[PDB]
Amino acid sequence: AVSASSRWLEGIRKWYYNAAGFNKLGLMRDDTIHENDDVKEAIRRLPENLYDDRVFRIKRALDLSMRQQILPKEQWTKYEEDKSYLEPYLKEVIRERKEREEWAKK
């Protein structure tokens, strides 16, 4: 259904994504997340392929940050191509903690 308002909402989201600039280092959104306990558990649950891809992406970014350089524009992560690979692991970890917290109430 939804057309004109949605693309503008997406436009501000896409604008901010580019201004954030983790994509200039080849980072995905989920690579940049602060490692709390919920997050560390989500990393631990990642499958082999995704875990190893995550590390290479961090390494390549820390390497760039040391040299104070960025990737060629060709190689920046496109907002449309940004895979929220951690989110469903993290969501489930949060859901598990919240159930424990409800049981601890009663």
Partner: protein
């Protein structure tokens, strides 16, 4: 950077007499110091989360 420049402003007002423009702007810089930290920076972090669908 608005905090840093607010602090520069406060260091300027610190070093000047308690007289006409300096009083009211010293008050405004003092409000803004506590506004940036207690209110404005924690609102920016929340907006930035919402913007990244997080």
């Amino acid at each position: 950077w608005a905090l840093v420049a607010d602090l520069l402003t406060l260091t300027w007002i610190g070093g000047q007499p308690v007289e006409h423009p300096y009083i009211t702007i010293g008050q405004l810089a003092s409000v803004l110091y506590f506004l940036l930290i207690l209110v404005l920076m924690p609102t920016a972090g929340t907006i930035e989360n919402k913007l990244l669908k997080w």
